[PDB]
Structure formats: structure tokens, C-alpha cells
Amino acid sequence: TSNSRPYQMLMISAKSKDALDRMTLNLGNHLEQNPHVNLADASYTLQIGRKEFKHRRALVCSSTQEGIEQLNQPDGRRVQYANVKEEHPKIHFLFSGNGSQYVNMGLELYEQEAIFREAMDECFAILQSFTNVNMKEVLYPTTFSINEATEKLKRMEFSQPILFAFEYAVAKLLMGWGIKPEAMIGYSFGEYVAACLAEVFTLEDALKLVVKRGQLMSSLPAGVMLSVPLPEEELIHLINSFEKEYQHTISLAVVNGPACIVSGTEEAIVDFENELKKQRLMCMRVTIAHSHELDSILDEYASYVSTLTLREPKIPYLSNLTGTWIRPEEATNPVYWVKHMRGTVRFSDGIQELNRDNTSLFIEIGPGNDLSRLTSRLLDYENGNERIFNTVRSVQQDVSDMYFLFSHITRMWVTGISVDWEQFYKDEKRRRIPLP
């Protein structure tokens, strides 16, 4: 209980950069001079009940020696620094869509963080109760080999509710640390998690809904998705001509600003790729849908959604169908959910609405490097990175999950996002100690 987390964030703030840098160097020297100081107590002393000033520096370490090395170089790029100009920034959660999930994603958070673990275990209990499947064995295998869990995570009736649960739990972890969204937006499937957090549906009904969505989609052959670097109005013209010249349908699946994603069967997409080649246009497959291929399951989906309870949102969020704020009467209409399945995802429109306040800050919930890069570019071509913060590493990134999360929380905090340290320390026994 006096034990602490395996990573520690050190927070320092001051009324000028000069004072901040002197304090940073003083703290480094103090830790070098007393190398047995309790690092968790030092971290706690710098956070708990503390006034936060506008020049801020923060870093992550896992040992006193690592903290010393960083503090001795205050302007080193391992360390985060910013001068807060907006003290109460708008915080937006951005929910990742399907496609980047992997076995054991978030494992260190499941192991270490009570808030996260509790949210995940609630989801696993609800899923087991109505599906009779233990989905924890797939996400965090303790009897299956990773090989077998990976194969089972490829089935949509598993991957969709698992991603949903994971993103829900990440969001509850941040909210449980006092990081609350002023507004939200999902990329495609991510809208379902936004809606649950806005209390459009209960966690139980959301989990039933996404299991049903996954089950229905499992009956569909995989099609293909294709990125085309032209704006919406141009894709509309290309698709219209294509459908009249070939005997195939192409759906405009996603609008991402100056580029769009289209989708269809392999046959349709190969013909479309041929037409693009005739027009000497770039394209690239990006298959991971939102298309004509869903039409045969929509009636059944509509019927199911009609059985759930839908309520008006309590946190505002963007609609992927309309590209603007969801209306109360839209969220509560079962037909909205059916249309959302079939319809174009107006992602760039939603991001443009949020970016009307160009000091707003975005936290990506769930894994997805491509989505983070796209969003950054839509916020600001040179400097969008400074306003987006991630939560989960990509499958191939060999980095600790808690390290990755805390690296981004240190960035959030220096940029002006407050953390409820009382909740952060709710399961530890810490003491304030003397510091320079």
C-alpha cells in the first residue's frame, strides 16, 4: 500500500521559465545528493494539493537515476515543457475505429490500474452473461496460447465487443483521474463508445448492440476499402460515372478532408482501380465497413436496435452521419443507427467543427497510429501534434503500456489538462517529503 506504480511522473511549474528551470535543476541535484529519497513520495509531493503555474515541465521515470538524468537537462527532448496560455482547455475524446486491436492490448493497465480493471471486468461479466463466451480469454489469454487468441480476435463477434470494452475502459480510467471530455467524436465504430459514455445507452445495451452488429457482419464476405486522395465532391462524380459504366456499386465510406475512402466487393474495387488508372489517379488499398454490402442485414439490425433503450446524450458529440453535433432526436432514433451503418462517415466535418476552437485538445482513445496522424493533419498541417495525445501503443511498438500512457499524460498536463491527484492516489499510501 506504500508500494507505488512502476512509473512515476515528476511535475514542476512556475510563474516564469527562468524560475522553472532553476527549480528543475535544484530537484535534480537534491535527488542526486540523497539517492535513496522515496521517488513515489517525491512525485506525490510535487502533485498533491499543489498550485499549478503557467510554465510547466513534466517527465516520466522508473528510477531515481532516470529522473536525475532528465532533470539535469531541463530542455532535453525527453522532458515535456509548455507555457500554458489557455488554462481551461476544451478536452475532446476521439474514439478509434476497428482495425488496430490486438491480443493483450492494455495488459499492463489491466494488471496495474484498479479503475481500468474494474471497468473491463464489468464489460467481461456482461458479455459472458448474454453470449456465454469468456471474452477475457481472448483479450488477455491465460489458458489459450497467444496464437489461438489472435485467431479468435479476428472474428468480428469477438473483435467488436472487445474493442468497445477496451475503449470504454480507457475512457473510464481517464475520467476516473478527472480528465473529462467536454465533447466527443468517434471514427466510424468509435461513435458507439462515444454514445455509451454520453449515456445514450447503458453499458449492457451497448455491449448487446455491438455483439449483434458483429454477429450480423460475420455473415458478410470481406470486401475491400480504397483510399483516393481527392475531395468528396470529386469522389461523388467518379462513383456516379463508375456505377453507370460498370455493373457494380462503390460506396463512399469515409470522408477524411482532402482524401476519401471508398469500399465495395473485390470485383467492384478492381474495376474502380482500373478506372482510376485510366484517369492517372493515385489510390491505395486500406482494407480493415460502411457500404452497399451491408444492405441484406440492415432490416435485422434495425429490428434489434428497436428493442434497446435509447436516451438523449448527456455529453455532446459529433455525428458521423451528418458531420455536425448529434441531435437528441437522432441519437434516440433506431433508424439513425441503421443509417450510420450504411452511410458515409463524415469524419473531417466533425473534426472541423471541434477545431473551431483551435486551442481544444484531443485525446485518442484506443490504438490507432494512422488515425492519430490523420487527425493531427486535419487540426493543423505544421503543428497539429501539439494538440493530440494518445493512450495506447500500436501492436508493433515495443514500449510499456503504462510508460506510453504516462508519457502522454505528462504532455497533456504541461499543455494545461488537470489531473485529479486525489483519485490517482486513491489506492496508495504516500507522504509529503521535504524538497527544495
Author numbering: 5 to 292, 296 to 443
Task: Copy the relevant paper text.
The acyltransferase (AT) domain in PKSs is considered the gatekeeper domain because its function is to recognize a particular thioesterified extender unit with high specificity and to transacylate it onto a downstream acyl carrier protein (ACP) domain. ZMA is a polyketide/nonribosomal peptide hybrid antibiotic produced by Bacillus cereus strains UW85 and AH1134 that exhibits activity against a variety of Gram-negative and Gram-positive bacteria, as well as certain protists and plant pathogenic fungi. Our analyses also revealed the existence of two rare PKS extender units aminomalonyl-ACP and hydroxymalonyl-ACP, and the AT domains that are specific for them, ZmaF and ZmaA-AT, respectively. The structure presented here of a hydroxymalonyl-ACP-specific AT expands our understanding of AT domain recognition of ACP-linked extender units.
